[PDB]
Structures are given as structure tokens and as C-alpha cells.
């Protein structure tokens, strides 16, 4: 299914994903299009920060949902 | 009367309200339809964040007005 990931700068990333994809998998798909490593990616949906262990289905993320991507600096 | 609340996900929520409803009442009605706790709701109308102890009438929110909902983490 298709989902959208919006950065805080207004840019929209389109991904192909399955309900059983984990948040980490979703982050790796963002890495394939943008180059952003999963460890710098914070995903939000409906006022909740998404956890790497959980799946899209766990969060009730359905077709054509929008996730919000927040980028973070690398500590080192 | 009917008012509308728009979320930033594109959804419109329709509520049945009266002019004497307080902002808290409105937030509780949003909780009944969406499950969002009042303490995570910020309602925006005419450039203002709406305050809990005031009524729709106080803000001149009339039939078929649209509020915008912002969610806290």
C-alpha cells in the first residue's frame, strides 16, 4: 500500500509498504529514497511517536496515511 | 447548531453544539468522536487559541464555523 511521509520542511516522500512492515523497515525505505539513516529518523503519526519494534498495523496506519518525519543530529 | 473541526490530517469532525458550550465541552465532544484527550487538544479559531473557561458565544463562533485542531505529543 501507499503511504506518505512529510518532513517538517513540507517535502513529501511517497513509499510502498505493507501493514506488517515494522517502523524500522519504513525508516529503511526512507533511507533508500533520501539517504537518511534510520538512527536519525523520528516518525510521528496522530500525535504519537512511532516505536521501532511496532508495525504499521499496530498503529492503525492505513492506505494513504501521512507520517511526519523529524530529523535529528547524530551524537557521534 | 453544527460546527466543524478540521484536523491537519484532512479530516473534518462535525459536532452538535450550542452557543453556551464552553471550550472544555467542545474538547470533550472531540474526545467522544476521536478519542483524543482534552489535555492534548489545541483549538484554533480566528487567529486565537481558544481558552477552556470561555464559551463559543464569547468567541463569536456561529453555526457552520470551522475550528482547527492541533495535537500535542
Amino acid at each position: 500500500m501507499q503511504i506518505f511521509v512529510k518532513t517538517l520542511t513540507g517535502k513529501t516522500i511517497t513509499l510502498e509498504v505493507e501493514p506488517s512492515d515494522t517502523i524500522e523497515n519504513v525508516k529503511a525505505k526512507i533511507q533508500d529514497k533520501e539517504g537518511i539513516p534510520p538512527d536519525q529518523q523520528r516518525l510521528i503519526f496522530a500525535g504519537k511517536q512511532l516505536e521501532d519494534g511496532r508495525t504499521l498495523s499496530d498503529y492503525n496506519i492505513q492506505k494513504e496515511s501521512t507520517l511526519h518525519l523529524v530529523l535529528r543530529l547524530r551524537g557521534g | 447548531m453544527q460546527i466543524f473541526v478540521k484536523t491537519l490530517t484532512g479530516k473534518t469532525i462535525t459536532l452538535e453544539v450550542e452557543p453556551s458550550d464552553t471550550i472544555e465541552n467542545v474538547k470533550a465532544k472531540i474526545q467522544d468522536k476521536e478519542g483524543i484527550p482534552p489535555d492534548q487538544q489545541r483549538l484554533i479559531f480566528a487567529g486565537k487559541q481558544l481558552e477552556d473557561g470561555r464559551t463559543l458565544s464569547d468567541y463569536n463562533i456561529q453555526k457552520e464555523s470551522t475550528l482547527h485542531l492541533v495535537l500535542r505529543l
Binding site: 517538517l8 523529524v70 | 491537519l8 489545541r42 480566528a46 487567529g47 475550528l67 482547527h68 485542531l69 492541533v70
Partner: peptide, 19 residues
């Protein structure tokens, strides 16, 4: 106030998401 409420709401949601 036209699009004021939408554009303000979007910016605010965003501020919330940066927290």
C-alpha cells in the same frame, strides 16, 4: 481571516512535533 487558521495550525502542529 482566510487561510490564517490553517497556516497557523500547520505551523503549530509542526512546533509540537519538534518537541
Amino acid at each position: 481571516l482566510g487561510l490564517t487558521d490553517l497556516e497557523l495550525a500547520q505551523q503549530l502542529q509542526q512546533e509540537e512535533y519538534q518537541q
